[PDB]
PDB file of C-alpha atoms and ligand atoms in Angstrom:
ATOM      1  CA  UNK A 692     -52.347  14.603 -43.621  1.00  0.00           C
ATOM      2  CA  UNK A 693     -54.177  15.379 -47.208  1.00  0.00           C
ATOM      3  CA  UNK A 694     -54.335  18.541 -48.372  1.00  0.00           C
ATOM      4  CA  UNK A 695     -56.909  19.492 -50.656  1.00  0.00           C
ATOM      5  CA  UNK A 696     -56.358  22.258 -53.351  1.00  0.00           C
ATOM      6  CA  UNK A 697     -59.867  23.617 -53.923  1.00  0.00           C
ATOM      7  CA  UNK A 698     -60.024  27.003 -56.441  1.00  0.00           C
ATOM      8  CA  UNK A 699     -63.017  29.137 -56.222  1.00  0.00           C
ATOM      9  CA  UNK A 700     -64.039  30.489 -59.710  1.00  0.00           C
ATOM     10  CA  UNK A 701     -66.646  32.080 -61.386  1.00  0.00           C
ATOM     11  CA  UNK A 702     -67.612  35.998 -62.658  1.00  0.00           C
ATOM     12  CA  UNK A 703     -67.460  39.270 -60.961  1.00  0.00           C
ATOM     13  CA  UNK A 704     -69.924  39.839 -57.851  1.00  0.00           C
ATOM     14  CA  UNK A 705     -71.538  35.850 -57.818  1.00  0.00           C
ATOM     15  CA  UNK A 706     -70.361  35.186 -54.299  1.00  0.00           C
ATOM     16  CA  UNK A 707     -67.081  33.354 -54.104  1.00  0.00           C
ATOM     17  CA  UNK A 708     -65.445  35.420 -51.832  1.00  0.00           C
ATOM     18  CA  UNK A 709     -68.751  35.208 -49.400  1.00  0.00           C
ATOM     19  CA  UNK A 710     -69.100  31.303 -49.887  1.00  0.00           C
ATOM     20  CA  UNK A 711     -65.289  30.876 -48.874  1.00  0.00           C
ATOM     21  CA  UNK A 712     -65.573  33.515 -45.545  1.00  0.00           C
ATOM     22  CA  UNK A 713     -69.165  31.242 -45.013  1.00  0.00           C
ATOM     23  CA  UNK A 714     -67.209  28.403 -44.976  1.00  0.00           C
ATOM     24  CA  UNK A 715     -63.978  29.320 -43.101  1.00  0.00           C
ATOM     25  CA  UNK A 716     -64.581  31.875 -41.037  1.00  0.00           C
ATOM     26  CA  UNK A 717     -68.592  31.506 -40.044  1.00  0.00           C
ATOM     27  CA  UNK A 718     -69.958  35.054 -40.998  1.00  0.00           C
ATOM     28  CA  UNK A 719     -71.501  36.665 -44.052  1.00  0.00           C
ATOM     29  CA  UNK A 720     -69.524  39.451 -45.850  1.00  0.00           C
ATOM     30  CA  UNK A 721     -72.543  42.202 -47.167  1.00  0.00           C
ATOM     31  CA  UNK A 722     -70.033  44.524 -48.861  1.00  0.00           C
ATOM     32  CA  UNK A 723     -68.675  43.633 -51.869  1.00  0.00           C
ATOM     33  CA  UNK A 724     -64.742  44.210 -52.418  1.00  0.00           C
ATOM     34  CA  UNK A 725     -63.447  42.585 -55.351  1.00  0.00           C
ATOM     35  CA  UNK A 726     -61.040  40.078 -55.227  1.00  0.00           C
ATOM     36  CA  UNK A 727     -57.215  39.781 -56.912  1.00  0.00           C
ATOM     37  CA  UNK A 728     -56.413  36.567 -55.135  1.00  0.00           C
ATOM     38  CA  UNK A 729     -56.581  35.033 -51.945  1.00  0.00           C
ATOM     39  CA  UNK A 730     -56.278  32.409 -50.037  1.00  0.00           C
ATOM     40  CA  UNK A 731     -57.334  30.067 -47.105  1.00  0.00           C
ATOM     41  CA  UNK A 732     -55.999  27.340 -45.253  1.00  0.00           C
ATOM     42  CA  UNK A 733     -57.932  25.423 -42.817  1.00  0.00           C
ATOM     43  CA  UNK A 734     -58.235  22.023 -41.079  1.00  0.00           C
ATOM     44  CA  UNK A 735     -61.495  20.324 -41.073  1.00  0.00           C
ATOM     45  CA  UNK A 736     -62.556  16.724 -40.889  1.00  0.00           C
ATOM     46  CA  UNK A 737     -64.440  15.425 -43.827  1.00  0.00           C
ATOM     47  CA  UNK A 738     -65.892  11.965 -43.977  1.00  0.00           C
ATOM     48  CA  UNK A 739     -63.998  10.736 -40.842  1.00  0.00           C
ATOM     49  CA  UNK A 740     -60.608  12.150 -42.721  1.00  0.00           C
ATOM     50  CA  UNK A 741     -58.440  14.424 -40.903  1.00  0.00           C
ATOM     51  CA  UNK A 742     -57.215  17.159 -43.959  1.00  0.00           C
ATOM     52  CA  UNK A 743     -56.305  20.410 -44.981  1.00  0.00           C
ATOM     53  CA  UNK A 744     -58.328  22.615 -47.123  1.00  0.00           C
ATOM     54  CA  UNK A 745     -56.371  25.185 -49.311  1.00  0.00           C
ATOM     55  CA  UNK A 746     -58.883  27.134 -50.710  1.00  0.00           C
ATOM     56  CA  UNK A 747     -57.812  29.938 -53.744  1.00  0.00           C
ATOM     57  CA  UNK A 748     -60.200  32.535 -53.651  1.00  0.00           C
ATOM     58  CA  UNK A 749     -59.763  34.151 -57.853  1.00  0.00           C
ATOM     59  CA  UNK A 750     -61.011  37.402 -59.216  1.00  0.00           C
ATOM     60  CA  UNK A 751     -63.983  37.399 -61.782  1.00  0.00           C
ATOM     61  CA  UNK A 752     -63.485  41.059 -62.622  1.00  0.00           C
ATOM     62  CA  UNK A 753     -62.289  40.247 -66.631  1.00  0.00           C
ATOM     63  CA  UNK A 754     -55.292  28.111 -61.599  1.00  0.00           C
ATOM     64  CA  UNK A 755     -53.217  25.132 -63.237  1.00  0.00           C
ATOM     65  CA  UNK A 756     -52.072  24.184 -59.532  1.00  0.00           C
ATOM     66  CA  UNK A 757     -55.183  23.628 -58.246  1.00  0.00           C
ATOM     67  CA  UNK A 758     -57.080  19.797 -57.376  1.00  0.00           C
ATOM     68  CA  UNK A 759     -60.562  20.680 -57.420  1.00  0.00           C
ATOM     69  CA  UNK A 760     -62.435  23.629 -59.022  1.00  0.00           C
ATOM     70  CA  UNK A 761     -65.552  25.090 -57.457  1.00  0.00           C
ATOM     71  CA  UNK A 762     -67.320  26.647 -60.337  1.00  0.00           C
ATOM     72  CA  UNK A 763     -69.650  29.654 -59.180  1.00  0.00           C
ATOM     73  CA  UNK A 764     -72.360  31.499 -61.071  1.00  0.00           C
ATOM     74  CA  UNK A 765     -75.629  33.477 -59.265  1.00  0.00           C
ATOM     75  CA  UNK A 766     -79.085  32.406 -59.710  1.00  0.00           C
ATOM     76  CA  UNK A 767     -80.247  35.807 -60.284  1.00  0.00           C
ATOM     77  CA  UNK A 768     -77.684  36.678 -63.207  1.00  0.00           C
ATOM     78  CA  UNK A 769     -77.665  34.651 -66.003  1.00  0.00           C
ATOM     79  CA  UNK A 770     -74.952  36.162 -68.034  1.00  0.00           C
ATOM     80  CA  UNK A 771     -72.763  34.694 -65.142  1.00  0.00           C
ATOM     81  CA  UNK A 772     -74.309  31.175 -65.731  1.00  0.00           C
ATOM     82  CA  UNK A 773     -73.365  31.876 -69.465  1.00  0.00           C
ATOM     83  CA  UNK A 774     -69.816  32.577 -68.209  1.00  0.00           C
ATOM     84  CA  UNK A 775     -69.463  29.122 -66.626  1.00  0.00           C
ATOM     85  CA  UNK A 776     -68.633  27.323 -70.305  1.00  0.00           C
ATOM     86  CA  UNK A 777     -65.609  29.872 -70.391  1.00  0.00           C
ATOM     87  CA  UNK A 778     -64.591  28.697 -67.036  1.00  0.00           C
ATOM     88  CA  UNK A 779     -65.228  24.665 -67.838  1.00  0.00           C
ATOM     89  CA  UNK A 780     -62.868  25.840 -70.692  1.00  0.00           C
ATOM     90  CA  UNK A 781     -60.032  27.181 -68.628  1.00  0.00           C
ATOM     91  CA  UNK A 782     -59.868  24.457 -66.309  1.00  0.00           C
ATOM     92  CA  UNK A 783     -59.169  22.408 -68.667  1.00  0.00           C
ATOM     93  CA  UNK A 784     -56.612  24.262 -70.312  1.00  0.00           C
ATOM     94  CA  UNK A 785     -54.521  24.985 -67.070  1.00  0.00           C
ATOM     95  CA  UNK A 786     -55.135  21.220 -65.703  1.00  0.00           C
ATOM     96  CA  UNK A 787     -54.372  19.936 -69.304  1.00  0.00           C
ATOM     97  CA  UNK A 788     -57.192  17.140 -68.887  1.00  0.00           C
ATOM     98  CA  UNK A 789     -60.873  16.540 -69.777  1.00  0.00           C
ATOM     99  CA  UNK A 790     -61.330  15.203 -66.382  1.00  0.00           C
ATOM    100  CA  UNK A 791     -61.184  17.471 -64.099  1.00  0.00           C
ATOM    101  CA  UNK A 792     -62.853  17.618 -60.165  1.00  0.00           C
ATOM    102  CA  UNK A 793     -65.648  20.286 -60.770  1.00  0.00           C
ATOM    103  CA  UNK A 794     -68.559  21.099 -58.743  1.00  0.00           C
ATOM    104  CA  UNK A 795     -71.186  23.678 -60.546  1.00  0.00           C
ATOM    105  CA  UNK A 796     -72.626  25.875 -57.551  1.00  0.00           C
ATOM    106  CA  UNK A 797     -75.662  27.966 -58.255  1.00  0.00           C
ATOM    107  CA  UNK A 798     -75.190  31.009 -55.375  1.00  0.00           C
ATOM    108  CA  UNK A 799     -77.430  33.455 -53.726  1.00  0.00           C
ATOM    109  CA  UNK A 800     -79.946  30.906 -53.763  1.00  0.00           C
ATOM    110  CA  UNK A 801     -81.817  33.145 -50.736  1.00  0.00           C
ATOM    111  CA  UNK A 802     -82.903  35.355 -53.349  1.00  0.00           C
ATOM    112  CA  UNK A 803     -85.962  35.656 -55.374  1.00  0.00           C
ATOM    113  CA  UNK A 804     -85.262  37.430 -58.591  1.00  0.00           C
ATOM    114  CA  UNK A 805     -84.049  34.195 -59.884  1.00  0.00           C
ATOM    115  CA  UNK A 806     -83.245  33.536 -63.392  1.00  0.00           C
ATOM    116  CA  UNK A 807     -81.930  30.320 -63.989  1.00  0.00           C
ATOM    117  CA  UNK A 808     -83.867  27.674 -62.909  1.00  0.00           C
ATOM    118  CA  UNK A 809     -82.540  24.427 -60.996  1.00  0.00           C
ATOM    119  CA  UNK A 810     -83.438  22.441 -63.769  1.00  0.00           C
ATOM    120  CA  UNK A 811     -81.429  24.433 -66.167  1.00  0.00           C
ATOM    121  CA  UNK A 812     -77.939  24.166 -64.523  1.00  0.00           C
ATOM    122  CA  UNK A 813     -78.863  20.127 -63.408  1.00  0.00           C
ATOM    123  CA  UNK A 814     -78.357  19.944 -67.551  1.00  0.00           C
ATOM    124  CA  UNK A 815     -75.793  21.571 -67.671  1.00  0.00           C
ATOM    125  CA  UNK A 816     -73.626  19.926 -64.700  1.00  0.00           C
ATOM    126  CA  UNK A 817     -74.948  16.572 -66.520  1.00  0.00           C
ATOM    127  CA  UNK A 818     -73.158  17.516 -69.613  1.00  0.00           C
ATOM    128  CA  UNK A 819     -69.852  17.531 -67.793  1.00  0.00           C
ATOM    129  CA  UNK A 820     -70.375  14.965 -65.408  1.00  0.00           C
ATOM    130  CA  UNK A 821     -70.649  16.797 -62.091  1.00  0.00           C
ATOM    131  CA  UNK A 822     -72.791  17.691 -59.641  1.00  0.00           C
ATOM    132  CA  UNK A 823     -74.902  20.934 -59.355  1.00  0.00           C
ATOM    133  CA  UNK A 824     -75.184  22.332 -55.816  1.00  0.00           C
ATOM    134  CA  UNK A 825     -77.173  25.322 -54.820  1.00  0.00           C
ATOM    135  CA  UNK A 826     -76.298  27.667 -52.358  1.00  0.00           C
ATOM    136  CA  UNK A 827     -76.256  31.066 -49.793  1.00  0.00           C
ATOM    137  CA  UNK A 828     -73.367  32.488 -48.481  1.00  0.00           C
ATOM    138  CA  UNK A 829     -76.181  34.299 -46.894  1.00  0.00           C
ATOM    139  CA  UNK A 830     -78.146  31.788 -45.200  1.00  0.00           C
ATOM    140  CA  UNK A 831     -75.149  29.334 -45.148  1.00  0.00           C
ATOM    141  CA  UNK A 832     -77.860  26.959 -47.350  1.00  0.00           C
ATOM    142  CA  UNK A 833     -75.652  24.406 -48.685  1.00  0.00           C
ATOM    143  CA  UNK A 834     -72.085  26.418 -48.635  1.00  0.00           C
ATOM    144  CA  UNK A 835     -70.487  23.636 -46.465  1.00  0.00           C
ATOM    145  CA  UNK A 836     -72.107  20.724 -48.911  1.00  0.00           C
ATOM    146  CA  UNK A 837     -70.782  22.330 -52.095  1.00  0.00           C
ATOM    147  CA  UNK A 838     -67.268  22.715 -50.485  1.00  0.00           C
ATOM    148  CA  UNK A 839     -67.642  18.966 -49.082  1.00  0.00           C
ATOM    149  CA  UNK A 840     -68.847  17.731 -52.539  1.00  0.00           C
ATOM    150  CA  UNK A 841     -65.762  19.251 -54.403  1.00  0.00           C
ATOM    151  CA  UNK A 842     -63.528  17.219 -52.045  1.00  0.00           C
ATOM    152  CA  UNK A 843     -65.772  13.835 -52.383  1.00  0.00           C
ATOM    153  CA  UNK A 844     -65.292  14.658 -56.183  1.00  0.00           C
ATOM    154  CA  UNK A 845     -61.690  15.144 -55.780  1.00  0.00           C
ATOM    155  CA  UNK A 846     -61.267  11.772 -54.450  1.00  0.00           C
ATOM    156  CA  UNK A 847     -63.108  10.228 -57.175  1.00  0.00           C
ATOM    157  CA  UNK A 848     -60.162  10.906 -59.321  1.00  0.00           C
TER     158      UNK A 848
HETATM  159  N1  GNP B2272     -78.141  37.704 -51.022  1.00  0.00           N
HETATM  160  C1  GNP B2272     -76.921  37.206 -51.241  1.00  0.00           C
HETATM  161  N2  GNP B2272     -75.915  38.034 -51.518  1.00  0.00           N
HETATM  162  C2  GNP B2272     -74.750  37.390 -51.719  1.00  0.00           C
HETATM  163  C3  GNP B2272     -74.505  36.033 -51.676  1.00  0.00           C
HETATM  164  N3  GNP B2272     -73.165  35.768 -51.931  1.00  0.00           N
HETATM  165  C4  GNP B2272     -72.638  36.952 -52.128  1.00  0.00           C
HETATM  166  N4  GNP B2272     -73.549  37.977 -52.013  1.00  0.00           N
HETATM  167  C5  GNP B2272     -73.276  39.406 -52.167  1.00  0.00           C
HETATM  168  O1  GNP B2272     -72.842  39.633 -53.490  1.00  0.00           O
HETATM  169  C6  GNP B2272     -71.782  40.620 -53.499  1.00  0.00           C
HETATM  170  C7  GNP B2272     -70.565  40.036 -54.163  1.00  0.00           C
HETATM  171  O2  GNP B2272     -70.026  38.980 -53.340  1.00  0.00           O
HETATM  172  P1  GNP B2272     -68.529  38.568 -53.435  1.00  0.00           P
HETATM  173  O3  GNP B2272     -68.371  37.315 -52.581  1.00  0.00           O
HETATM  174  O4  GNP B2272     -67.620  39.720 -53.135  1.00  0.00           O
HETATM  175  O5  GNP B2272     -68.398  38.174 -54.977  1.00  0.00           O
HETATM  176  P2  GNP B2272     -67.083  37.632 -55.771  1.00  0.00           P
HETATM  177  O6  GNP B2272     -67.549  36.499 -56.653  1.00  0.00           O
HETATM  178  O7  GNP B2272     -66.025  37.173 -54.806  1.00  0.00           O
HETATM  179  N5  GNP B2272     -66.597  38.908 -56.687  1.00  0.00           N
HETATM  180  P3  GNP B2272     -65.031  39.059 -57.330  1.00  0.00           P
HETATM  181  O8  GNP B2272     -64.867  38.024 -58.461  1.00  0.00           O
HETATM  182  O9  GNP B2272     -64.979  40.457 -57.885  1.00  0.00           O
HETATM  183  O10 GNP B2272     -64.019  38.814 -56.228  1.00  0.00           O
HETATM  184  C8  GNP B2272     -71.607  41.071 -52.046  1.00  0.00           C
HETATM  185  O11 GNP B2272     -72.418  42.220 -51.816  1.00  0.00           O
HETATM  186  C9  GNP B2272     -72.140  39.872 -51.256  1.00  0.00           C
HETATM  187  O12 GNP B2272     -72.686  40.202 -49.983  1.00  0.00           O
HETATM  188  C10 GNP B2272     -75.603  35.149 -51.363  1.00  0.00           C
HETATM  189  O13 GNP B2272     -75.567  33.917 -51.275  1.00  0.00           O
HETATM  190  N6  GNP B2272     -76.783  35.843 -51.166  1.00  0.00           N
HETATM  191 CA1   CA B2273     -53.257  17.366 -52.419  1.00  0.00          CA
HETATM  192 CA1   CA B2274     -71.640  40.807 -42.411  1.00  0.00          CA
HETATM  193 MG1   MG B2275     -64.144  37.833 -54.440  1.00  0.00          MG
HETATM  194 MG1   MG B2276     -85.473  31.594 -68.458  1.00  0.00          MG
HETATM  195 NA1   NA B2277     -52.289  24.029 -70.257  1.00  0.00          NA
END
């Protein structure tokens, strides 16, 4: 069956640890333990297609193998929104392409100190061509939609 290589990325403390334990595993991690790398594997049907997610979890705390990326910032920190051109960068340094399968997520979309508006990352996902999700690990609020979209986008390519 397909697999799909997703890669979680993004800057210290925005959530991609939580989204990915959302998504696989169905429960919201409160503590936060930074990451050095991890993965998942899991199947799932998508779209009526039997496949395998592989999902790389990567640290934020300051790749080329991967299919899709799953680029993470938090609503309520905009220096990590900031940090997304250096990761739009990377990607396509380690992919060696300017068209990559990219999915901009805006996390932690439950809370209320927020900071960068919708309309703000919509602009900037337009700029690359992808879409811009919004979501809480918290809540669950979009987390299997993002993951979904990245694959959709995958297939695109
Ligand atoms: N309210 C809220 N808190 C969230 C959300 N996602 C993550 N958090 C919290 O934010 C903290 C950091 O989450 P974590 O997933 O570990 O972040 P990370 O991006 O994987 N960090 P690292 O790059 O260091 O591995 C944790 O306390 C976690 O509970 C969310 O959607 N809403
Ligand atoms: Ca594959
Ligand atoms: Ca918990
Ligand atoms: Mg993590
Ligand atoms: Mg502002
Ligand atoms: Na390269």
């Amino acid at each position: 069956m397909t697999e799909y290589k997703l890669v979680v990325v993004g800057a210290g403390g925005v959530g991609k640890s939580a989204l990915t334990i959302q998504l696989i595993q169905n429960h919201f991690v409160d503590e936060y333990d930074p990451t050095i790398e991890d993965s998942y594997r899991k199947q799932v049907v998508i779209d009526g297609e039997t496949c395998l997610l592989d999902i790389l979890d990567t640290a934020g705390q300051e790749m080329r193998t991967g299919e899709g990326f799953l680029c993470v910032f938090a609503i309520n920190n905009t220096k990590s929104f900031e940090d997304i051109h250096q990761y739009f960068e990377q990607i396509k340094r380690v992919k060696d392409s300017d068209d990559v399968p990219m999915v901009l997520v805006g996390n932690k979309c439950d809370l209320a100190a927020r900071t960068v508006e919708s309309r703000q990352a919509q602009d900037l996902a337009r700029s690359y061509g992808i879409p811009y999700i919004e979501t809480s690990a918290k809540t669950r609020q979009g987390v299997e939609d993002a993951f979904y979209t990245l694959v959709r986008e995958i297939r695109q390519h």
